[PDB]
């Protein structure tokens, strides 16, 4: 186990110093946006370490 510890994998732009991006807003496809659905395109930004 120990899947509690997450880390952000994809973001639209690099962080400012001491930034805290708590939002799990879905990443941008490059194509037309995905207004709240995962899949092919607009993937989920977080990722569990394991």
């Amino acid at each position, epitope marked *: *186990g120990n*899947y509690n510890y997450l880390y952000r*994998l994809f973001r639209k732009s690099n962080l400012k110093p001491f930034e805290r991006d708590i939002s*799990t807003e879905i990443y941008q496809a490059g194509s037309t946006p995905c207004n709240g*659905v*995962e*899949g*092919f395109n607009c*993937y*989920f930004p*977080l*990722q*569990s*370490y*394991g």
Partner: antibody
Amino acid sequence: QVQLVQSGAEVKKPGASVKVSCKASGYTFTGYYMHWVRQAPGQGLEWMGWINPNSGGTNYTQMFQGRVTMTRDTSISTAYMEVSRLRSDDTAVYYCARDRSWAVVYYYMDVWGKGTTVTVSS
Amino acid sequence: ALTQPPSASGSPGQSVTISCTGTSSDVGGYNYVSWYQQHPGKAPKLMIYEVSKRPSGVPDRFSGSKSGNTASLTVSGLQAEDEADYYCSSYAGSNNLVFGGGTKLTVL
């Protein structure tokens, strides 16, 4: 080991429900998306949907949205697929599959379970 | 669904091909088309993952590429190891994946 451990075969009364469980092993359970595909013994193969152990989001086809739900269980590194109404048209071997894609949801389905045979009788 | 020819024939050491006639929509411009090799009584494995790419452990005898609307993978120098049916797959828009009907590779 990337072998998926899949639950035993189950027989169900028609119209009722059934749940299928696949236990991941060896690989990292978190990011790797897990699809669910059915193969009727007649012919062909069809795709229902996927669950991801990272976020828990679902998606389905139109043929199964509102008729079948899926869920995860990160404690035992397993994901469950639930069917609400086991119709006689749904006698099939249900396969759980992993994608090559690491944390993205491309449909590159590589390693498959040994086959949980689902039988609907009357 | 994706239409597909039902069968193909050959002999060990020959070269044959298989295809599935999907539309220009949902196959041609909508990439990530993949094929799978399925023996009866056992789980299948991905055999071409991209439109033209082989996963690790794939033998060199297998090759495929989309061609306009249709897609096709051909096998040369076959043996008794390839007596299985072959299913193709495409994204087909908005998380609604579809498989083909499946063609059976036969060897004399």
